[PDB]
PDB file of C-alpha atoms and ligand atoms in Angstrom:
ATOM      1  CA  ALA A 288     -14.036   5.993 -15.355  1.00  0.00           C
ATOM      2  CA  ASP A 289     -11.029   3.645 -14.784  1.00  0.00           C
ATOM      3  CA  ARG A 290      -9.012   6.710 -13.143  1.00  0.00           C
ATOM      4  CA  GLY A 291      -9.151  10.404 -12.367  1.00  0.00           C
ATOM      5  CA  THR A 292      -7.959  13.049 -10.123  1.00  0.00           C
ATOM      6  CA  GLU A 293      -9.656  14.683  -7.144  1.00  0.00           C
ATOM      7  CA  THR A 294      -8.765  17.383  -4.557  1.00  0.00           C
ATOM      8  CA  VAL A 295      -8.401  16.042  -0.980  1.00  0.00           C
ATOM      9  CA  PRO A 296      -7.932  19.208   1.294  1.00  0.00           C
ATOM     10  CA  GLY A 297      -4.891  19.014   3.432  1.00  0.00           C
ATOM     11  CA  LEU A 298      -3.546  15.770   1.778  1.00  0.00           C
ATOM     12  CA  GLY A 299      -0.286  17.531   0.892  1.00  0.00           C
ATOM     13  CA  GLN A 300       0.620  17.815   4.609  1.00  0.00           C
ATOM     14  CA  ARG A 301       0.339  14.086   5.023  1.00  0.00           C
ATOM     15  CA  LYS A 302       2.038  13.497   1.652  1.00  0.00           C
ATOM     16  CA  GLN A 303       5.146  15.501   3.184  1.00  0.00           C
ATOM     17  CA  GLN A 304       5.059  13.353   6.383  1.00  0.00           C
ATOM     18  CA  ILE A 305       5.136  10.264   4.604  1.00  0.00           C
ATOM     19  CA  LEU A 306       8.074  11.578   2.535  1.00  0.00           C
ATOM     20  CA  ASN A 307       9.742  12.896   5.843  1.00  0.00           C
ATOM     21  CA  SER A 308       9.342   9.435   7.609  1.00  0.00           C
ATOM     22  CA  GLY A 309      11.406   7.511   5.017  1.00  0.00           C
ATOM     23  CA  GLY A 310       8.969   7.215   2.349  1.00  0.00           C
ATOM     24  CA  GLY A 311       9.733   7.833  -1.368  1.00  0.00           C
ATOM     25  CA  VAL A 312       7.387   8.628  -4.320  1.00  0.00           C
ATOM     26  CA  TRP A 313       6.809   5.058  -4.911  1.00  0.00           C
ATOM     27  CA  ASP A 314       5.483   4.373  -1.523  1.00  0.00           C
ATOM     28  CA  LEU A 315       3.306   7.561  -1.840  1.00  0.00           C
ATOM     29  CA  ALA A 316       1.854   6.044  -5.120  1.00  0.00           C
ATOM     30  CA  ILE A 317       0.951   2.664  -3.207  1.00  0.00           C
ATOM     31  CA  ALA A 318      -0.549   4.518  -0.351  1.00  0.00           C
ATOM     32  CA  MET A 319      -2.469   6.925  -2.635  1.00  0.00           C
ATOM     33  CA  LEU A 320      -4.256   4.104  -4.338  1.00  0.00           C
ATOM     34  CA  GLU A 321      -4.989   2.405  -0.916  1.00  0.00           C
ATOM     35  CA  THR A 322      -6.934   5.323   0.863  1.00  0.00           C
ATOM     36  CA  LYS A 323      -8.230   8.577   0.011  1.00  0.00           C
ATOM     37  CA  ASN A 324      -6.631  10.318   3.083  1.00  0.00           C
ATOM     38  CA  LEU A 325      -3.288   8.508   3.112  1.00  0.00           C
ATOM     39  CA  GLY A 326      -4.397   7.215   6.525  1.00  0.00           C
ATOM     40  CA  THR A 327      -4.907   4.070   8.685  1.00  0.00           C
ATOM     41  CA  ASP A 328      -8.375   4.875   9.879  1.00  0.00           C
ATOM     42  CA  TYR A 329     -10.233   2.346   7.684  1.00  0.00           C
ATOM     43  CA  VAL A 330     -11.966  -0.296   9.539  1.00  0.00           C
ATOM     44  CA  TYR A 331      -9.603  -2.483  11.804  1.00  0.00           C
ATOM     45  CA  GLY A 332      -7.834  -4.972   9.614  1.00  0.00           C
ATOM     46  CA  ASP A 333      -9.723  -3.668   6.643  1.00  0.00           C
ATOM     47  CA  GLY A 334     -12.583  -5.889   7.929  1.00  0.00           C
ATOM     48  CA  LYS A 335     -10.325  -9.070   7.679  1.00  0.00           C
ATOM     49  CA  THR A 336      -8.673 -11.305  10.008  1.00  0.00           C
ATOM     50  CA  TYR A 337      -5.322 -13.466  10.459  1.00  0.00           C
ATOM     51  CA  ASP A 338      -3.205 -13.717   7.303  1.00  0.00           C
ATOM     52  CA  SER A 339      -5.704 -11.519   5.313  1.00  0.00           C
ATOM     53  CA  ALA A 340      -5.918  -8.511   7.805  1.00  0.00           C
ATOM     54  CA  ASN A 341      -4.678  -5.201   6.317  1.00  0.00           C
ATOM     55  CA  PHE A 342      -2.673  -2.661   8.518  1.00  0.00           C
ATOM     56  CA  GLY A 343      -0.769   0.651   7.866  1.00  0.00           C
ATOM     57  CA  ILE A 344      -1.344   3.276   5.095  1.00  0.00           C
ATOM     58  CA  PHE A 345      -0.606   0.564   2.350  1.00  0.00           C
ATOM     59  CA  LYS A 346      -2.984  -2.025   3.781  1.00  0.00           C
ATOM     60  CA  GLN A 347      -0.280  -4.646   3.782  1.00  0.00           C
ATOM     61  CA  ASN A 348      -1.546  -8.045   4.774  1.00  0.00           C
ATOM     62  CA  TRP A 349      -0.164 -10.093   7.730  1.00  0.00           C
ATOM     63  CA  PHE A 350       0.887 -12.943   5.609  1.00  0.00           C
ATOM     64  CA  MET A 351       3.475 -10.497   3.836  1.00  0.00           C
ATOM     65  CA  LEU A 352       4.359  -8.735   7.131  1.00  0.00           C
ATOM     66  CA  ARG A 353       4.951 -12.145   8.919  1.00  0.00           C
ATOM     67  CA  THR A 354       7.114 -13.426   6.254  1.00  0.00           C
ATOM     68  CA  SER A 355       9.192 -10.432   4.844  1.00  0.00           C
ATOM     69  CA  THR A 356       9.784  -7.719   7.398  1.00  0.00           C
ATOM     70  CA  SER A 357      12.466  -7.457  10.107  1.00  0.00           C
ATOM     71  CA  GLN A 358       9.673  -6.333  12.663  1.00  0.00           C
ATOM     72  CA  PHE A 359       7.395  -9.352  11.961  1.00  0.00           C
ATOM     73  CA  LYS A 360       9.181 -12.181  10.399  1.00  0.00           C
ATOM     74  CA  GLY A 361       8.727 -15.336  12.055  1.00  0.00           C
ATOM     75  CA  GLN A 362       5.485 -14.584  13.765  1.00  0.00           C
ATOM     76  CA  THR A 363       2.345 -16.877  13.255  1.00  0.00           C
ATOM     77  CA  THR A 364      -1.071 -16.385  11.646  1.00  0.00           C
ATOM     78  CA  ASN A 365      -2.412 -16.394  15.018  1.00  0.00           C
ATOM     79  CA  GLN A 366      -0.297 -13.419  15.938  1.00  0.00           C
ATOM     80  CA  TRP A 367      -1.886 -11.045  13.378  1.00  0.00           C
ATOM     81  CA  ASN A 368      -3.042  -8.402  15.611  1.00  0.00           C
ATOM     82  CA  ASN A 369       0.431  -7.544  16.200  1.00  0.00           C
ATOM     83  CA  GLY A 370       0.488  -5.924  12.771  1.00  0.00           C
ATOM     84  CA  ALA A 371      -1.780  -3.124  14.241  1.00  0.00           C
ATOM     85  CA  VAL A 372       1.179  -1.336  15.626  1.00  0.00           C
ATOM     86  CA  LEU A 373       1.740  -0.261  11.988  1.00  0.00           C
ATOM     87  CA  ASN A 374      -1.532   1.940  12.313  1.00  0.00           C
ATOM     88  CA  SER A 375       0.134   4.497  14.516  1.00  0.00           C
ATOM     89  CA  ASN A 376       3.757   4.216  13.614  1.00  0.00           C
ATOM     90  CA  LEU A 377       4.149   5.575  10.115  1.00  0.00           C
ATOM     91  CA  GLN A 378       8.074   5.106  10.144  1.00  0.00           C
ATOM     92  CA  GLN A 379       7.661   1.234  11.029  1.00  0.00           C
ATOM     93  CA  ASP A 380       4.769   1.134   8.536  1.00  0.00           C
ATOM     94  CA  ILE A 381       7.032   2.543   5.751  1.00  0.00           C
ATOM     95  CA  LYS A 382       9.928   0.511   6.734  1.00  0.00           C
ATOM     96  CA  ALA A 383       8.116  -2.753   6.668  1.00  0.00           C
ATOM     97  CA  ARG A 384       6.670  -2.125   3.219  1.00  0.00           C
ATOM     98  CA  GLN A 385      10.246  -1.338   1.834  1.00  0.00           C
ATOM     99  CA  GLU A 386      11.846  -4.376   3.571  1.00  0.00           C
ATOM    100  CA  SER A 387       8.767  -6.657   2.264  1.00  0.00           C
ATOM    101  CA  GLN A 388       9.516  -5.410  -1.445  1.00  0.00           C
ATOM    102  CA  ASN A 389      13.148  -5.722  -0.967  1.00  0.00           C
ATOM    103  CA  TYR A 390      12.715  -9.448   0.324  1.00  0.00           C
ATOM    104  CA  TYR A 391      10.149 -10.488  -2.467  1.00  0.00           C
ATOM    105  CA  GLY A 392      11.318  -8.227  -5.408  1.00  0.00           C
ATOM    106  CA  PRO A 393       8.729  -5.814  -7.023  1.00  0.00           C
ATOM    107  CA  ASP A 394       6.853  -8.548  -9.100  1.00  0.00           C
ATOM    108  CA  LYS A 395       6.405 -11.067  -6.256  1.00  0.00           C
ATOM    109  CA  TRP A 396       5.773  -8.117  -3.859  1.00  0.00           C
ATOM    110  CA  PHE A 397       3.047  -7.059  -6.000  1.00  0.00           C
ATOM    111  CA  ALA A 398       1.484 -10.636  -6.174  1.00  0.00           C
ATOM    112  CA  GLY A 399       1.511 -11.214  -2.299  1.00  0.00           C
ATOM    113  CA  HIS A 400       0.389  -7.708  -1.532  1.00  0.00           C
ATOM    114  CA  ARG A 401      -2.434  -7.924  -3.937  1.00  0.00           C
ATOM    115  CA  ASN A 402      -3.352 -11.689  -3.682  1.00  0.00           C
ATOM    116  CA  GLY A 403      -1.951 -12.869  -0.345  1.00  0.00           C
ATOM    117  CA  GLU A 404       0.084 -16.071  -0.113  1.00  0.00           C
ATOM    118  CA  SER A 405      -1.595 -17.584  -3.256  1.00  0.00           C
ATOM    119  CA  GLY A 406      -0.468 -14.774  -5.458  1.00  0.00           C
ATOM    120  CA  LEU A 407       3.116 -15.963  -4.964  1.00  0.00           C
ATOM    121  CA  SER A 408       2.210 -19.067  -7.061  1.00  0.00           C
ATOM    122  CA  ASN A 409       2.286 -16.794 -10.268  1.00  0.00           C
ATOM    123  CA  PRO A 410       2.956 -13.077  -9.880  1.00  0.00           C
ATOM    124  CA  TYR A 411       1.899 -12.368 -13.434  1.00  0.00           C
ATOM    125  CA  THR A 412      -1.898 -13.032 -13.444  1.00  0.00           C
ATOM    126  CA  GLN A 413      -4.087 -10.409 -14.820  1.00  0.00           C
ATOM    127  CA  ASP A 414      -5.727  -9.254 -11.554  1.00  0.00           C
ATOM    128  CA  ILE A 415      -2.068  -8.832 -10.137  1.00  0.00           C
ATOM    129  CA  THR A 416      -1.053  -6.842 -13.319  1.00  0.00           C
ATOM    130  CA  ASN A 417      -4.236  -4.495 -13.062  1.00  0.00           C
ATOM    131  CA  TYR A 418      -2.849  -3.620  -9.655  1.00  0.00           C
ATOM    132  CA  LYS A 419       0.567  -3.129 -10.799  1.00  0.00           C
ATOM    133  CA  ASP A 420      -0.609  -0.963 -13.741  1.00  0.00           C
ATOM    134  CA  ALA A 421      -2.544   1.297 -11.332  1.00  0.00           C
ATOM    135  CA  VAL A 422       0.287   1.799  -9.085  1.00  0.00           C
ATOM    136  CA  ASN A 423       2.417   2.645 -12.167  1.00  0.00           C
ATOM    137  CA  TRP A 424       0.021   5.077 -13.483  1.00  0.00           C
ATOM    138  CA  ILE A 425      -0.185   6.948 -10.045  1.00  0.00           C
ATOM    139  CA  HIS A 426       3.293   7.032  -9.701  1.00  0.00           C
ATOM    140  CA  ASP A 427       3.822   8.428 -13.410  1.00  0.00           C
ATOM    141  CA  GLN A 428       1.341  11.284 -12.272  1.00  0.00           C
ATOM    142  CA  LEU A 429       3.144  12.156  -9.102  1.00  0.00           C
ATOM    143  CA  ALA A 430       6.575  11.899 -10.773  1.00  0.00           C
ATOM    144  CA  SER A 431       5.339  14.205 -13.484  1.00  0.00           C
ATOM    145  CA  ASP A 432       5.425  17.477 -11.317  1.00  0.00           C
ATOM    146  CA  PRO A 433       6.980  18.168  -8.084  1.00  0.00           C
ATOM    147  CA  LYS A 434       4.075  20.159  -6.934  1.00  0.00           C
ATOM    148  CA  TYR A 435       2.045  16.643  -6.620  1.00  0.00           C
ATOM    149  CA  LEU A 436       4.333  15.710  -3.652  1.00  0.00           C
ATOM    150  CA  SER A 437       3.005  18.662  -1.647  1.00  0.00           C
ATOM    151  CA  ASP A 438      -0.434  19.766  -2.897  1.00  0.00           C
ATOM    152  CA  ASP A 439      -3.645  18.374  -2.217  1.00  0.00           C
ATOM    153  CA  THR A 440      -4.169  16.368  -5.519  1.00  0.00           C
ATOM    154  CA  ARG A 441      -5.072  12.699  -5.385  1.00  0.00           C
ATOM    155  CA  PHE A 442      -4.673  10.613  -8.434  1.00  0.00           C
ATOM    156  CA  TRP A 443      -6.917   7.385  -8.178  1.00  0.00           C
ATOM    157  CA  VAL A 444      -7.435   4.338 -10.226  1.00  0.00           C
ATOM    158  CA  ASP A 445     -10.407   1.853  -9.831  1.00  0.00           C
ATOM    159  CA  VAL A 446      -8.849  -1.381  -9.787  1.00  0.00           C
ATOM    160  CA  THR A 447     -12.006  -3.672 -10.655  1.00  0.00           C
TER     161      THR A 447
HETATM  162  O1  LIG B 598      -7.907  -2.130  -4.875  1.00  0.00           O
HETATM  163  C1  LIG B 598      -6.936  -1.464  -4.689  1.00  0.00           C
HETATM  164  C2  LIG B 598      -7.255  -0.707  -3.447  1.00  0.00           C
HETATM  165  O2  LIG B 598      -8.264   0.223  -3.662  1.00  0.00           O
HETATM  166  C3  LIG B 598      -8.608   1.046  -2.552  1.00  0.00           C
HETATM  167  O3  LIG B 598      -9.900   1.875  -2.938  1.00  0.00           O
HETATM  168  C4  LIG B 598      -9.673   2.989  -3.684  1.00  0.00           C
HETATM  169  C5  LIG B 598     -10.213   2.683  -5.143  1.00  0.00           C
HETATM  170  O4  LIG B 598      -9.175   1.517  -5.843  1.00  0.00           O
HETATM  171  C6  LIG B 598     -10.092   3.901  -5.816  1.00  0.00           C
HETATM  172  O5  LIG B 598      -8.796   4.318  -5.982  1.00  0.00           O
HETATM  173  C7  LIG B 598     -11.114   4.902  -5.411  1.00  0.00           C
HETATM  174  O6  LIG B 598     -11.023   6.196  -5.971  1.00  0.00           O
HETATM  175  C8  LIG B 598     -12.374   6.580  -5.961  1.00  0.00           C
HETATM  176  C9  LIG B 598     -12.359   8.081  -5.974  1.00  0.00           C
HETATM  177  O7  LIG B 598     -11.977   8.328  -4.502  1.00  0.00           O
HETATM  178  C10 LIG B 598     -13.622   8.906  -6.226  1.00  0.00           C
HETATM  179  O8  LIG B 598     -14.475   8.757  -4.995  1.00  0.00           O
HETATM  180  C11 LIG B 598     -14.279   8.487  -7.421  1.00  0.00           C
HETATM  181  O9  LIG B 598     -15.595   8.954  -7.561  1.00  0.00           O
HETATM  182  C12 LIG B 598     -16.223   8.545  -8.831  1.00  0.00           C
HETATM  183  C13 LIG B 598     -15.478   9.229  -9.937  1.00  0.00           C
HETATM  184  O10 LIG B 598     -15.236  10.703  -9.470  1.00  0.00           O
HETATM  185  C14 LIG B 598     -16.155   9.283 -11.173  1.00  0.00           C
HETATM  186  O11 LIG B 598     -17.284   9.989 -10.923  1.00  0.00           O
HETATM  187  C15 LIG B 598     -16.612   7.851 -11.544  1.00  0.00           C
HETATM  188  O12 LIG B 598     -17.134   7.699 -12.829  1.00  0.00           O
HETATM  189  O13 LIG B 598     -17.610   7.187 -10.576  1.00  0.00           O
HETATM  190  C16 LIG B 598     -16.900   7.235  -9.226  1.00  0.00           C
HETATM  191  C17 LIG B 598     -17.786   6.719  -8.277  1.00  0.00           C
HETATM  192  O14 LIG B 598     -18.625   7.509  -7.785  1.00  0.00           O
HETATM  193  O15 LIG B 598     -14.336   6.899  -7.508  1.00  0.00           O
HETATM  194  C18 LIG B 598     -13.189   6.168  -7.579  1.00  0.00           C
HETATM  195  C19 LIG B 598     -13.337   4.807  -7.732  1.00  0.00           C
HETATM  196  O16 LIG B 598     -13.951   4.401  -6.517  1.00  0.00           O
HETATM  197  O17 LIG B 598     -10.584   5.328  -3.925  1.00  0.00           O
HETATM  198  C20 LIG B 598     -10.450   4.147  -3.151  1.00  0.00           C
HETATM  199  C21 LIG B 598      -9.860   4.439  -1.742  1.00  0.00           C
HETATM  200  O18 LIG B 598     -10.714   5.273  -1.200  1.00  0.00           O
HETATM  201  C22 LIG B 598      -8.963   0.199  -1.419  1.00  0.00           C
HETATM  202  O19 LIG B 598     -10.223  -0.598  -1.623  1.00  0.00           O
HETATM  203  C23 LIG B 598      -7.920  -0.714  -0.957  1.00  0.00           C
HETATM  204  O20 LIG B 598      -8.468  -1.484   0.015  1.00  0.00           O
HETATM  205  C24 LIG B 598      -7.399  -1.453  -2.018  1.00  0.00           C
HETATM  206  O21 LIG B 598      -6.432  -2.400  -1.889  1.00  0.00           O
END
Protein backbone atom coordinates (compact mmCIF):
# COMPACT_ATOMS: atom_id res chain seq x y z
CA ALA A 1 0.00 0.00 0.00
CA ASP A 2 0.75 3.73 -0.12
CA ARG A 3 1.18 3.94 3.64
CA GLY A 4 0.81 2.06 6.87
CA THR A 5 2.04 1.41 10.36
CA GLU A 6 4.68 -0.82 11.89
CA THR A 7 6.16 -1.43 15.31
CA VAL A 8 9.84 -0.61 15.64
CA PRO A 9 10.87 -1.95 19.07
CA GLY A 10 12.55 0.75 21.14
CA LEU A 11 11.83 3.61 18.74
CA GLY A 12 9.93 5.62 21.38
CA GLN A 13 13.23 6.08 23.22
CA ARG A 14 14.72 7.76 20.16
CA LYS A 15 11.50 9.74 19.58
CA GLN A 16 11.88 11.22 23.04
CA GLN A 17 15.57 12.01 22.50
CA ILE A 18 14.65 13.94 19.36
CA LEU A 19 11.93 15.85 21.23
CA ASN A 20 14.42 16.49 24.07
CA SER A 21 17.09 17.86 21.70
CA GLY A 22 15.07 20.75 20.30
CA GLY A 23 12.87 18.75 17.94
CA GLY A 24 9.14 19.23 17.59
CA VAL A 25 6.41 16.93 16.33
CA TRP A 26 6.89 18.33 12.81
CA ASP A 27 10.59 17.39 12.90
CA LEU A 28 9.70 13.88 14.11
CA ALA A 29 7.33 13.44 11.16
CA ILE A 30 10.08 14.31 8.67
CA ALA A 31 12.59 12.05 10.40
CA MET A 32 10.02 9.25 10.63
CA LEU A 33 9.61 9.23 6.86
CA GLU A 34 13.35 9.39 6.18
CA THR A 35 14.47 6.29 8.13
CA LYS A 36 12.83 3.41 9.96
CA ASN A 37 14.99 3.83 13.09
CA LEU A 38 15.11 7.67 13.29
CA GLY A 39 18.84 7.17 12.81
CA THR A 40 21.86 8.29 10.83
CA ASP A 41 23.41 4.88 10.11
CA TYR A 42 22.32 4.72 6.50
CA VAL A 43 25.17 4.62 3.99
CA TYR A 44 27.43 7.67 4.19
CA GLY A 45 25.84 10.58 2.37
CA ASP A 46 22.95 8.25 1.50
CA GLY A 47 25.24 7.02 -1.29
CA LYS A 48 25.57 10.49 -2.84
CA THR A 49 28.28 13.11 -3.05
CA TYR A 50 28.75 16.91 -3.17
CA ASP A 51 25.50 18.95 -3.23
CA SER A 52 23.38 15.76 -3.30
CA ALA A 53 24.87 14.03 -0.24
CA ASN A 54 22.47 13.54 2.70
CA PHE A 55 23.33 13.86 6.40
CA GLY A 56 21.47 13.68 9.69
CA ILE A 57 18.19 12.05 10.69
CA PHE A 58 16.30 14.06 8.05
CA LYS A 59 18.74 13.26 5.22
CA GLN A 60 19.22 16.96 4.52
CA ASN A 61 21.24 17.54 1.37
CA TRP A 62 24.42 19.59 1.31
CA PHE A 63 22.94 22.17 -1.05
CA MET A 64 20.30 23.06 1.51
CA LEU A 65 22.80 22.93 4.35
CA ARG A 66 25.35 25.25 2.76
CA THR A 67 22.71 27.76 1.65
CA SER A 68 20.36 28.05 4.63
CA THR A 69 21.87 27.02 8.01
CA SER A 70 23.91 29.14 10.40
CA GLN A 71 26.26 26.18 10.84
CA PHE A 72 27.04 25.75 7.10
CA LYS A 73 25.97 28.87 5.14
CA GLY A 74 28.71 30.14 2.84
CA GLN A 75 30.52 26.84 2.44
CA THR A 76 31.16 25.32 -0.96
CA THR A 77 30.02 22.21 -2.80
CA ASN A 78 33.55 20.81 -2.40
CA GLN A 79 33.22 21.10 1.41
CA TRP A 80 30.25 18.68 1.46
CA ASN A 81 31.86 16.21 3.86
CA ASN A 82 31.53 18.91 6.55
CA GLY A 83 27.84 18.01 6.73
CA ALA A 84 28.70 14.63 8.27
CA VAL A 85 29.06 16.20 11.74
CA LEU A 86 25.26 16.12 11.77
CA ASN A 87 25.37 12.31 11.83
CA SER A 88 26.63 12.49 15.41
CA ASN A 89 25.23 15.80 16.75
CA LEU A 90 21.45 15.45 16.99
CA GLN A 91 20.98 18.97 18.36
CA GLN A 92 22.93 20.59 15.52
CA ASP A 93 21.06 18.27 13.14
CA ILE A 94 17.68 19.48 14.44
CA LYS A 95 18.80 23.11 14.61
CA ALA A 96 20.05 23.09 11.01
CA ARG A 97 16.80 21.68 9.62
CA GLN A 98 14.69 24.21 11.53
CA GLU A 99 16.88 27.10 10.35
CA SER A 100 16.77 25.75 6.79
CA GLN A 101 12.97 25.73 6.83
CA ASN A 102 12.82 29.14 8.54
CA TYR A 103 15.11 30.52 5.83
CA TYR A 104 13.28 29.07 2.82
CA GLY A 105 9.77 28.87 4.27
CA PRO A 106 7.92 25.54 4.33
CA ASP A 107 7.06 25.27 0.62
CA LYS A 108 10.50 26.09 -0.72
CA TRP A 109 12.13 24.04 2.04
CA PHE A 110 10.11 21.03 0.87
CA ALA A 111 11.19 21.71 -2.72
CA GLY A 112 14.91 21.98 -2.07
CA HIS A 113 14.92 19.21 0.50
CA ARG A 114 13.14 16.85 -1.90
CA ASN A 115 14.56 17.97 -5.28
CA GLY A 116 17.69 19.90 -4.35
CA GLU A 117 18.68 23.16 -6.00
CA SER A 118 16.48 22.59 -9.05
CA GLY A 119 13.43 22.17 -6.82
CA LEU A 120 13.66 25.84 -5.90
CA SER A 121 12.68 26.56 -9.53
CA ASN A 122 9.09 25.56 -8.72
CA PRO A 123 8.17 24.21 -5.26
CA TYR A 124 4.70 23.12 -6.43
CA THR A 125 5.57 20.27 -8.78
CA GLN A 126 3.82 16.94 -8.26
CA ASP A 127 6.85 15.03 -6.95
CA ILE A 128 7.35 17.68 -4.26
CA THR A 129 3.65 17.72 -3.36
CA ASN A 130 3.78 13.91 -3.01
CA TYR A 131 6.58 14.31 -0.47
CA LYS A 132 4.72 17.18 1.26
CA ASP A 133 1.57 15.07 1.43
CA ALA A 134 3.46 12.16 3.00
CA VAL A 135 4.93 14.33 5.77
CA ASN A 136 1.53 15.90 6.41
CA TRP A 137 -0.05 12.46 6.75
CA ILE A 138 2.63 11.23 9.19
CA HIS A 139 2.31 14.41 11.23
CA ASP A 140 -1.48 14.01 11.37
CA GLN A 141 -0.95 10.49 12.74
CA LEU A 142 1.63 11.48 15.36
CA ALA A 143 -0.50 14.49 16.29
CA SER A 144 -3.66 12.40 16.77
CA ASP A 145 -2.60 10.81 20.07
CA PRO A 146 0.20 11.85 22.45
CA LYS A 147 1.09 8.19 22.90
CA TYR A 148 2.69 8.22 19.44
CA LEU A 149 5.41 10.56 20.76
CA SER A 150 6.78 7.89 23.13
CA ASP A 151 5.62 4.43 21.96
CA ASP A 152 7.29 2.26 19.29
CA THR A 153 4.85 3.01 16.44
CA ARG A 154 6.14 4.19 13.06
CA PHE A 155 3.78 5.64 10.47
CA TRP A 156 5.24 5.26 6.99
CA VAL A 157 4.41 6.37 3.45
CA ASP A 158 5.87 4.94 0.24
CA VAL A 159 6.61 8.14 -1.71
CA THR A 160 7.00 6.75 -5.24
O1 LIG B 1 11.25 9.13 -0.20
C1 LIG B 1 11.25 9.80 1.03
C2 LIG B 1 12.16 9.08 1.97
O2 LIG B 1 11.79 7.65 2.00
C3 LIG B 1 12.74 6.85 2.84
O3 LIG B 1 12.38 5.54 2.79
C4 LIG B 1 11.25 5.10 3.47
C5 LIG B 1 10.07 4.87 2.57
O4 LIG B 1 9.61 6.15 2.02
C6 LIG B 1 8.97 4.22 3.32
O5 LIG B 1 8.53 5.10 4.38
C7 LIG B 1 9.47 2.92 3.93
O6 LIG B 1 8.46 2.26 4.56
C8 LIG B 1 8.45 0.84 4.28
C9 LIG B 1 8.12 0.23 5.62
O7 LIG B 1 9.23 0.46 6.53
C10 LIG B 1 7.84 -1.24 5.57
O8 LIG B 1 9.07 -1.96 5.39
C11 LIG B 1 6.86 -1.60 4.45
O9 LIG B 1 6.90 -2.94 4.17
C12 LIG B 1 5.88 -3.36 3.14
C13 LIG B 1 4.52 -3.00 3.70
O10 LIG B 1 4.39 -3.48 5.07
C14 LIG B 1 3.41 -3.59 2.91
O11 LIG B 1 3.52 -5.02 3.06
C15 LIG B 1 3.53 -3.21 1.43
O12 LIG B 1 2.49 -3.68 0.68
O13 LIG B 1 4.83 -3.72 0.89
C16 LIG B 1 5.95 -3.10 1.62
C17 LIG B 1 7.26 -3.58 1.07
O14 LIG B 1 7.43 -4.92 1.41
O15 LIG B 1 7.17 -0.90 3.16
C18 LIG B 1 7.31 0.54 3.29
C19 LIG B 1 7.55 1.05 1.90
O16 LIG B 1 8.88 0.77 1.56
O17 LIG B 1 10.57 3.17 4.91
C20 LIG B 1 11.68 3.83 4.21
C21 LIG B 1 12.72 4.12 5.24
O18 LIG B 1 13.21 2.87 5.63
C22 LIG B 1 14.18 7.01 2.37
O19 LIG B 1 14.32 6.38 1.08
C23 LIG B 1 14.59 8.44 2.27
O20 LIG B 1 15.89 8.51 1.61
C24 LIG B 1 13.61 9.29 1.52
O21 LIG B 1 14.02 10.53 1.29
